[PDB]
Design a protein around this ligand. Structure first.
Ligand SMILES: CC(=O)Nc1ccc(OCC(=O)O)cc1
Ligand SMILES: *[C@@H]1O[C@H](CO)[C@@H](O)[C@H](O)[C@H]1NC(C)=O
Length: 336
């Protein structure tokens, strides 16, 4: 169980102005820290955010959050469920900003909702420094789906924050799960991201802005465009046939088969120069906080093993780049 703490800086809020927070379980003898970003799509104008407020309020408000959550998958403390980092200090940061973790805008007389996802991450880091983070050796920023994209948008800023606060000895790394999307042609979203960025006052990593410049920052929400610009190590976990990708492609089998196969091949191609990556040929969504995340294997190697191999490589038979080459979903027998 991770215990809830609401942010002491009450100017950092969820969408409706209620305070944001984080769930924590410390591990007294460990210098490793895992900060996980929850997913759950986004909203991009008032009408669309109003609908989300009626039926997905826990992703917009803390007023109904429970006092504890159970850690599962990579957030488990049991070595059988989590061979990789079971002894780590565990943090679960709920998603209540609906901005793919990019926003820096307070609720005010001109704004019905607050979009502060980028500021929420920074404030969590600040408040953890007085709870043991100041003696850390590694901080792994992880996240799933919209939280996976949020890792890519925020990992370099966390490292920059700790450097300027005087902690250059903490190694910041990222783990992006199911947040690596393509801006491809539909079978029958870029505009939604572009409009949300303006609604949210969203921010993107600095080198990626300087390349694409004003009006085009929406490009930095796509992994294969922002990843080459990042300075911190980032491991990428991504199903070749991600369910959210097929949704934004209007896919829900006759020859026009070719579309799904072309999607698998293109996502394969974008990962060719990503040295640390795990990409099975499955139709599914998220993996790292699910209880049976140890079951999936790529070419004989499990995901917890690959993450351990990544750890050693940052210090034979322990690979870190694992991408399936079969071109149809569920061709890998270990798919969920
Ligand atoms: C261009 C675009 O639409 N990108 C995108 C898609 C889905 C997202 O979230 C899915 C989830 O959180 O399940 C977040 C961002
Ligand atoms: C509280 O958070 C806001 C937004 O990030 C920041 O401007 C302000 O300086 C913070 N206050 C304190 C006391 O940390």
């Amino acid at each position: 169980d991770l215990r809830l703490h609401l942010l002491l800086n009450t100017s950092v809020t969820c969408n409706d102005g209620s305070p944001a927070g984080y769930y924590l379980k410390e591990s007294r003898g460990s210098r490793r820290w895992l900060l996980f970003l929850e997913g759950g799509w986004y909203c991009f104008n008032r009408e669309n955010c109003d609908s989300r407020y009626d039926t997905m309020r826990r992703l917009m408000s803390s007023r109904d959050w429970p006092r504890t959550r159970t850690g599962t998958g990579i957030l488990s403390s049991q070595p059988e469920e989590n061979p990789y980092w079971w002894n780590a200090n565990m943090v679960f940061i709920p998603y209540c900003s609906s901005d793919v973790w990019s926003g820096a805008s307070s609720k005010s007389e001109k704004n019905e909702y607050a979009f502060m996802g980028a500021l929420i991450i920074q404030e969590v880091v600040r408040e953890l420094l007085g709870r043991g983070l100041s003696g850390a050796k590694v901080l792994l920023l992880a996240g799933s789906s919209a939280g996976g994209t949020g890792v890519l948008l925020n990992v370099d800023r966390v490292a920059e924050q700790l450097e300027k606060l005087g902690y250059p000895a903490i190694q910041v790394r990222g783990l992006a799960d199911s947040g690596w999307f393509l801006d491809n042609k539909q079978y029958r979203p870029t505009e939604a991201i572009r409009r949300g960025i303006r609604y949210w006052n969203g921010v993107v990593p600095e080198r990626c802005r300087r390349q694409f410049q004003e009006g085009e920052e929406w490009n930095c929400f796509f992994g294969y465009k922002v990843y080459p610009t990042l300075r911190s190590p980032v491991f990428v976990v991504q199903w070749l046939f991600d369910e959210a990708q097929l949704t934004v492609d209007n896919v829900h089998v006759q020859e026009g088969r070719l579309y799904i196969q072309n999607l698998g091949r293109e996502l394969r191609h974008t990962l060719k120069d990503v040295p640390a990556s795990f990409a099975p040929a499955c139709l599914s969504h998220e993996i790292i906080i699910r209880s049976h995340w140890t079951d999936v294997q790529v070419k004989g190697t499990s995901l917890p093993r690959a993450l351990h191999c990544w750890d050693r490589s940052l210090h034979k038979g322990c690979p870190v780049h694992l991408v399936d080459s079969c071109p149809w979903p569920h061709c890998n027998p270990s798919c969920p």
